[PDB]
Amino acid sequence: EWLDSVQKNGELFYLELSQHSTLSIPHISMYLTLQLQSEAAREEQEILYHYPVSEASQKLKSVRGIFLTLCDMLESVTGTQVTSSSLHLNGKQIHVAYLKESDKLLLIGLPAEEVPLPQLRNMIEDVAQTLKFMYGSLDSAFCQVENAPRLDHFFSLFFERALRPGKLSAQQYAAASAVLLDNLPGVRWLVLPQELKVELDTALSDLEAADFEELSEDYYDMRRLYTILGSSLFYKGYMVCSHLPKDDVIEIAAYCRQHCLLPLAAKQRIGQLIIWREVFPRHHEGRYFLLVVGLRHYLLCVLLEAGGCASKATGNPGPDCIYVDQVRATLHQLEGVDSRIEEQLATSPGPCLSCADWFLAELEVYDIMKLTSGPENTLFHYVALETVQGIFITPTHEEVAQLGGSVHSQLIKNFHQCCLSIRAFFQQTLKEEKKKALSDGSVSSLSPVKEHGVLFECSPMSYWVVGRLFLNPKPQELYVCFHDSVSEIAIEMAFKLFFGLTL
Amino acid sequence: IVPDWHETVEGKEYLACILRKNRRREFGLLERPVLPPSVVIDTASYKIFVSGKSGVGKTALVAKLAGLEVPIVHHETTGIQTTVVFWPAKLKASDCVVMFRFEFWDCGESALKKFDHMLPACKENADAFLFLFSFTDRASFEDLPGQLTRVAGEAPGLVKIVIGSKFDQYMHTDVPARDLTAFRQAWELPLFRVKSVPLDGRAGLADTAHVLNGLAEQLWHQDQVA
Amino acid sequence: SPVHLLCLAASSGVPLFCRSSSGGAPSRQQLPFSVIGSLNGVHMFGQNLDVQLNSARTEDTTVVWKNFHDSITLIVLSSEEGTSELRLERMLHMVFGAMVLIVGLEELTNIRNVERLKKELRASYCLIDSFLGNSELIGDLTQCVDCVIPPEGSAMQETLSGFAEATGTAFVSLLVSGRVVAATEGWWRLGMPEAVLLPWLVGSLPPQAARDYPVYLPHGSPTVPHRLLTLTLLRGLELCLLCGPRPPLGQLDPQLMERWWQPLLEPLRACLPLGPRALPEGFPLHSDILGLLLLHLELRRCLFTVEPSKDKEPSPEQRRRLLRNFYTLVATTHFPQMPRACYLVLGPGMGWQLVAVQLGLRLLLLLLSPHTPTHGLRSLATRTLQALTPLL
Amino acid sequence: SFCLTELHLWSLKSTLHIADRDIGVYQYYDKEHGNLEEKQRLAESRDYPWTLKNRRPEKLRDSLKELEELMQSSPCVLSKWKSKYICQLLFGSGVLVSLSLSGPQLEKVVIDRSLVGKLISDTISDALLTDSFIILSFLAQNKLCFIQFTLSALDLKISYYDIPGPANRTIDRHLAVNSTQDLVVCWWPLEKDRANMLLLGFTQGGLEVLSFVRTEWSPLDVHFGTKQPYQVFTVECSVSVDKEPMADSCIYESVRNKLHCVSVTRIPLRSKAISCCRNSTEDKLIVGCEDSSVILYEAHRGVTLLAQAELRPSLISCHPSGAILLVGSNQGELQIFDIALSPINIQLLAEDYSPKETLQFKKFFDVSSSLVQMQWMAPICDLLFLRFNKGPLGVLLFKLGILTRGQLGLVDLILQYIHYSEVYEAISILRSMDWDTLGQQCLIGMGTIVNHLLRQRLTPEREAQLEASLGTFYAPTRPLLDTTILEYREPVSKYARRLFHHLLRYKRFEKAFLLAVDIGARDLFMDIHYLALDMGELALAEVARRRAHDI
Numbered sequence A: 001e002w003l004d005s006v007q008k009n010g011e012l013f014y015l016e017l018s019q020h021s022t023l024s025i026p027h028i029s030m031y032l033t034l035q036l037q038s039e040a041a042r043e044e045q046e047i048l049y050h051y052p053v054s055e056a057s058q059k060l061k062s063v064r065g066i067f068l069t070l071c072d073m074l075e076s077v078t079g080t081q082v083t084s085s086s087l088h089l090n091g092k093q094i095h096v097a098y099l100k101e102s103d104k105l106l107l108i109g110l111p112a113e114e115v116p117l118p119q120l121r122n123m124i125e126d127v128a129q130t131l132k133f134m135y136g137s138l139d140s141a142f143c144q145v146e147n148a149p150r151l152d153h154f155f156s157l158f159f160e161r162a163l164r165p166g167k168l169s170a171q172q173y174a175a176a177s178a179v180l181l182d183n184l185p186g187v188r189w190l191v192l193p194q195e196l197k198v199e200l201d202t203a204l205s206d207l208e209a210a211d212f213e214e215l216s217e218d219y220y221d222m223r224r225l226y227t228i229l230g231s232s233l234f235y236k237g238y239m240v241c242s243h244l245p246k247d248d249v250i251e252i253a254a255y256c257r258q259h260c261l262l263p264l265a266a267k268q269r270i271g272q273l274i275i276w277r278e279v280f281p282r283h284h285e286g287r288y289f290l291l292v293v294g295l296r297h298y299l300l301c302v303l304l305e306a307g308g309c310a311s312k313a314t315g316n317p318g319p320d321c322i323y324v325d326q327v328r329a330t331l332h333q334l335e336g337v338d339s340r341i342e343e344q345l346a347t348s349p350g351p352c353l354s355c356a357d358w359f360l361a362e363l364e365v366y367d368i369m370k371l372t373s374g375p376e377n378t379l380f381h382y383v384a385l386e387t388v389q390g391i392f393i394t395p396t397h398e399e400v401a402q403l404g405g406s407v408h409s410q411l412i413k414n415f416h417q418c419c420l421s422i423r424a425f426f427q428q429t430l431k432e433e434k435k436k437a438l439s440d441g442s443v444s445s446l447s448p449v450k451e452h453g454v455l456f457e458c459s460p461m462s463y464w465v466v467g468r469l470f471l472n473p474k475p476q477e478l479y480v481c482f483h484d485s486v487s488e489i490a491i492e493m494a495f496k497l498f499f500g501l502t503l
Numbered sequence B: 001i002v003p004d005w006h007e008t009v010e011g012k013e014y015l016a017c018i019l020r021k022n023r024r025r026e027f028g029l030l031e032r033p034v035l036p037p038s039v040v041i042d043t044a045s046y047k048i049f050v051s052g053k054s055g056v057g058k059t060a061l062v063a064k065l066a067g068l069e070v071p072i073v074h075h076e077t078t079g080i081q082t083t084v085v086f087w088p089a090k091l092k093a094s095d096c097v098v099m100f101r102f103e104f105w106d107c108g109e110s111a112l113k114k115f116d117h118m119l120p121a122c123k124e125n126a127d128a129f130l131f132l133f134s135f136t137d138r139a140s141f142e143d144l145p146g147q148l149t150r151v152a153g154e155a156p157g158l159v160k161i162v163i164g165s166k167f168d169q170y171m172h173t174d175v176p177a178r179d180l181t182a183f184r185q186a187w188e189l190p191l192f193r194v195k196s197v198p199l200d201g202r203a204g205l206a207d208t209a210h211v212l213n214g215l216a217e218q219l220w221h222q223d224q225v226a
Numbered sequence C: 001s002p003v004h005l006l007c008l009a010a011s012s013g014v015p016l017f018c019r020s021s022s023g024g025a026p027s028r029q030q031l032p033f034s035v036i037g038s039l040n041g042v043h044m045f046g047q048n049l050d051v052q053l054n055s056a057r058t059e060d061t062t063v064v065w066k067n068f069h070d071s072i073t074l075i076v077l078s079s080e081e082g083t084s085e086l087r088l089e090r091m092l093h094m095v096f097g098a099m100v101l102i103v104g105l106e107e108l109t110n111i112r113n114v115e116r117l118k119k120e121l122r123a124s125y126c127l128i129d130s131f132l133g134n135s136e137l138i139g140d141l142t143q144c145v146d147c148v149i150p151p152e153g154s155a156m157q158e159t160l161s162g163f164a165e166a167t168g169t170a171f172v173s174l175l176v177s178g179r180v181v182a183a184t185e186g187w188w189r190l191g192m193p194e195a196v197l198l199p200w201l202v203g204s205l206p207p208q209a210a211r212d213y214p215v216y217l218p219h220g221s222p223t224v225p226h227r228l229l230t231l232t233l234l235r236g237l238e239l240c241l242l243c244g245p246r247p248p249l250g251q252l253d254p255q256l257m258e259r260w261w262q263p264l265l266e267p268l269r270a271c272l273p274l275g276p277r278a279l280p281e282g283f284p285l286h287s288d289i290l291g292l293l294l295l296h297l298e299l300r301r302c303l304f305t306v307e308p309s310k311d312k313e314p315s316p317e318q319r320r321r322l323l324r325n326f327y328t329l330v331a332t333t334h335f336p337q338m339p340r341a342c343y344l345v346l347g348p349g350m351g352w353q354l355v356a357v358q359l360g361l362r363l364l365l366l367l368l369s370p371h372t373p374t375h376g377l378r379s380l381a382t383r384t385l386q387a388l389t390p391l392l
Numbered sequence D: 001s002f003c004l005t006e007l008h009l010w011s012l013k014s015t016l017h018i019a020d021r022d023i024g025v026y027q028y029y030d031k032e033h034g035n036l037e038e039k040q041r042l043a044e045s046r047d048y049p050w051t052l053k054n055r056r057p058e059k060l061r062d063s064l065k066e067l068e069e070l071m072q073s074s075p076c077v078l079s080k081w082k083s084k085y086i087c088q089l090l091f092g093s094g095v096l097v098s099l100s101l102s103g104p105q106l107e108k109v110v111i112d113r114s115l116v117g118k119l120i121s122d123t124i125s126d127a128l129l130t131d132s133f134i135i136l137s138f139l140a141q142n143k144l145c146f147i148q149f150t151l152s153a154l155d156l157k158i159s160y161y162d163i164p165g166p167a168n169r170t171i172d173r174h175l176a177v178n179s180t181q182d183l184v185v186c187w188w189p190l191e192k193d194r195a196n197m198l199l200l201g202f203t204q205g206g207l208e209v210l211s212f213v214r215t216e217w218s219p220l221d222v223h224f225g226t227k228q229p230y231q232v233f234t235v236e237c238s239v240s241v242d243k244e245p246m247a248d249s250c251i252y253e254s255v256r257n258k259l260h261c262v263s264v265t266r267i268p269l270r271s272k273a274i275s276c277c278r279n280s281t282e283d284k285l286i287v288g289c290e291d292s293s294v295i296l297y298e299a300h301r302g303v304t305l306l307a308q309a310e311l312r313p314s315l316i317s318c319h320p321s322g323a324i325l326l327v328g329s330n331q332g333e334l335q336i337f338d339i340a341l342s343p344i345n346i347q348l349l350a351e352d353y354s355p356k357e358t359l360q361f362k363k364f365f366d367v368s369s370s371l372v373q374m375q376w377m378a379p380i381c382d383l384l385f386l387r388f389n390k391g392p393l394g395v396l397l398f399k400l401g402i403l404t405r406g407q408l409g410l411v412d413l414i415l416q417y418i419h420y421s422e423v424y425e426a427i428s429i430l431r432s433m434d435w436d437t438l439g440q441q442c443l444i445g446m447g448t449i450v451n452h453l454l455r456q457r458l459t460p461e462r463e464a465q466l467e468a469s470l471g472t473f474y475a476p477t478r479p480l481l482d483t484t485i486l487e488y489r490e491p492v493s494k495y496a497r498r499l500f501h502h503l504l505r506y507k508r509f510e511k512a513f514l515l516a517v518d519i520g521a522r523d524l525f526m527d528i529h530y531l532a533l534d535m536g537e538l539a540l541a542e543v544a545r546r547r548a549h550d551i
């Protein structure tokens, strides 16, 4: 079936189901060599790859010498890497981000109107890391030339989402939240009852146990080809269960975002999805492979390791159909659980939420579900991030239970845009703390911030958006939005909302 | 003016009226030193224009005479400035104390040429000029006779004083004292030296008192002549 | 934390000046020539195309480019914490406007001789260094006139206006340090680039009893050598007169100044301890306040102080830096659905807290003691603003 | 890991001297203060009572004032939690009080004085409160005053009954009840005049002693069983032949209305016991000691646990979930412990985290009197009742997680310790769990701990933590686990397989070698030796194949 879709390099992308509009808006991606050969007669010798080929990118390509000049020259002046630049092109502001590795430079440029600078910086880090996950060091992706036809697809999806978000009311909500959530060091996670967590953990653990009686060595006189490292399961875009290390979970989710596999599962019934790749994880035989199997809104990712308990591998092997059958069979057994997981999405697994429109326009449980103080629920929206375990909690389809009128829908957008700005300070604090920790081997700084917030007025009401960073041995980020009528303490909300939370 | 009168005990008491905590008390444009109720002092005021080539220390000279901090960075003066300096003195002829209010007018060398009105502005009532030359620049020294004949011009009854600057940079001296003496042999000038050093609030007083008293002697005396 | 400012004539590629500072302290250090040529050459490379280069940054530092008219490119590099593109962009507008005040637009645009500027732009160095260095004023950052609340709403304004008739100009103001106590209606109607730079020009200079500086007016007469006069009648306190060729300073005799200012000597003496603190001493500030910044957005004026609680850390220098960094943050987020308040809580542990609110036309920011309850931050700022509303 | 709390004191007294910037403690007001308005704004924003209302039918502010005066005029004899938000107090001189609450907040105070003239007016010693009757003991007479209910104490019948016993010498008598009418037991420290415990029947003819016993040792406490309603459980202070303190534990059963001892257990103490508490599952006894030792014993096992309290733990209150034990003191200090007796840090609500090993009430509200009583408000259950001698009264509120739906069970402590990577503590709870009673919780707790550790880089410390976690099932102290092994063996062995693969990859060899033996897998031995072929460490060699053939 899917065997015919296996590529000569061992890659498999099988899917079965049950950009002219952007070209007026300037954008570009380029990979450049920083090693000049001025003796060469070749034009554009500096460009190893670029995308798109369009009027939209041609203007930025024509000024590419600026990026090369600044990257080396500013670094020579400050002793540090260049991270960004900002230009006006055809009267429109564009931000360009830089990432330099091994004497090569990656550049991404997007219009300021759709993409604030801090979003762009997170996007270049996300692109460089996802490319590294798929290909190893960036030269392995770009300098091969032959990879261009698929790099174009990767960038085509990247630009389409960045410039026309949600164009690829729940879909509009996802577009509103994507600006913040896709750049978090974690994945969206769904909070479940322990009864469901135990059933999911037990079923998921079968893969790591690798009790492959049908593939036993004594039956084939052969060592099994891979050791299963761990796996993680998603439903309808939410992670529900994982036995995999936090760093591997984030890299894998980034792959799935770039191929839109998770948001596709959120809208459509997929009859089958099978993906197989060699992958290049952060660890340290050194060969690892990623297998993804999807079914009926479920997406299951498994990492496989060569060597160890397993046989060594060389060359570029195709997918092992036996391991694929084991993953598919495991995922099929969860179909009977699907009604219970949906019930958890239908209800509020978290705190109770109120609609903003209401303000301008069993009971023990409902009071336990009030994150905010007082008899009235002033909570509208929140994002809770556990930075250690890579998981975050948001409102779900609850947002549709909220009216979503002219007041509420605008207020969701304001929340995510403000939280992007809040993270900028938190990210700066965290990097400084890591730098200090290594330097150990400032007064009036605004940088080491624990809280930030903004209050807004609205009309068809005061709407308060606040976030907090925790720098203690258990680092956390919390974002909450609530009505101005009730005062709140970030510590009490953080305790109530993070207590008992683990992957 | 009695030489080193300020070193006497009576002199110390009068220095105290311009000092606070052994530091200069700067005065506002219409502010005055406060005398003891038993003390009556004759107050005189003079209009002094500071002139010379850029980089000669004209701003630094006034700050030293004022007891104000002397700048290190050579910012150019952009326009007309006035510094007001208060300094008591005992008179040798009258035995009375006369207190001076010196107005140091300082247009800046560049400002004078860019704006034609500024030079006449500094001359509305001027009754003295200070001509600076550097010890480390012969050109400012050799141009001095021209400055003496052209800035003062033909005007009668005008006080002209030449001051050397940057003496502390002795290793860089371009003009030996022999040449300065030869200059004084032709011009009979009241030559003064200032070291415009950027220790404590009284340290400036001890060094600047020599030049302030020499300045007082010409301004006071010529006022008695008029 | 080094800062460097470069200016080049855009057409010649020849640097007109370089200025620098470290830690807010002015310095003589300049960039290497090959570096400077690359900093300007890259901008002009973009200019050969329609694409403008406005900014770039590195992990530790930021750089901003501006292109003024046809003749000037300004490039600034800064390692200072709290630096942002808006903060630098406003600073470059202030640097350019300072260049306009000293040589004018007629000389600065359409440049015929780079050498003429090399000698004439040195005149701007003291004011430029003030923008790059540490200062007690926020007008450069806010584009508001730095102001202080007068001891009286009557006698100061009445005397000032009568004096303006005596001096023959409609534009008169009294300021302590860089802070305006009172001003006439002519003086108040000046546009931001002029209204802010004028008191900065006066307050950045070494203290003088009197001044007459050439100013080319950023509005109305950028081609005419109008003159700014000041009279420092009391220490730290001076009048500004914005004048044509008359009066001469020699005609502003002490008797004239005694008639118009001796009757106010007592409240003027009071204005000196007032200088450092924008509010009346009896103003009911909360004891947790370390400092205050109030802006009136329609009237282009603001109050600033770090005086209200002298006993606690930070030092006054440190307090001003926190407020400047916070304003910069407010300026890019809360200020251009409609934001009305903002706050910060700093670490490590119990660090300092900051608040801001906007009520209609006026916006207040506070620096607060680390012990102040976080839930009271909004209600405190709101009450403080309401208490301030009658004053501004 | 710590618990976050806030305290509500139901009093109007200014004498508490509570800091006005302290948001963790609340007080009621009548019609130092510099931050009080800010605290009031928060309290009003949260719809807390602040100034109490006086309404014609219910003068709450004034009725509270009388209650405070009752506490000062006379000792409270009894406090009982009739419902999760309702309670009653009984005072000397017979005044009864009833309070009704909403969450932590007091809503009304009722003072009932109808009983005052009905009593013999001897000193009470102890009492039992009513659903249909009140029983009062006395120090100076061998009588139980009996009040039958059918102001609300209006439909009264008054009587009293003679009790067999010793001559009255101001006897420190105590009372307990199993299920209102069904059983009453009266006892005191020290044939009928030598006996010190009485089993009392409840009849239409009044209270009577059905039988009496004399215990071997004076009781520290007495309880009725909830699962065994006819059992009277005692903890008694005793001395060994080596003259060392012991806590006796004895069960007395009523058989044909004859009370007799059925079983005796003994637990050695490092010092003489000063307090007794039984847990909610009635399978553990917790004993406080004079030297501040805390000793726990599990009835189903020979296992005991020790801990050192800072507080001289004179009073103990077990949370109904069984997950939390609190140590109180007469000194007004509170300390929080795990069921494993691992210390838990505690904090009152504040803008920043700052946990402490112990909580001193004196630090926050300057209480002028000794702490007498702690109770969990069992008729979720996040309220702890506090009573000081001569007041104040109040409730300590515990913040509970939303995502746990307000639950604070042992499973939730595993999740909370894993949240903070406090692995040994999570393991000690897992060892405290009974596989034969709590199998679902044991599998979940183990899975959380193992899944947490297998995500981590291996270290020698973590090798021990992973081994210990599986050791809680594979190496039980109780061989009777064989009854339930068939239920748990599968999910546990699956974790063991994961551990084998994890340790093989780190070339530890020996642990993977032994794990394969305990697991008994046919093919797993084959990964052993296969690695050896590239290492030279052929400890198993060909034996892997012989074992595969035998399995």
Ligand SMILES: Nc1nc2c(ncn2[C@@H]2O[C@H](COP(=O)(O)OP(=O)(O)OP(=O)(O)O)[C@@H](O)[C@H]2O)c(=O)[nH]1
Residues within 6 Å of the ligand: B052, B053, B054, B055, B056, B057, B058, B059, B060, B061, B071, B072, B073, B074, B075, B076, B077, B108, B109, B110, B165, B166, B167, B168, B169, B194, B195, B196, B197
């Ligand atoms: N060492 C030393 N340096 C001096 C002295 N006088 C002036 N300088 C230096 O000379 C430079 C300029 O001094 P100014 O006082 O500004 O000379 P100016 O005559 O006021 O120059 P304009 O403002 O253009 O008129 C500074 O860098 C000072 O440090 C002196 O006596 N000793």
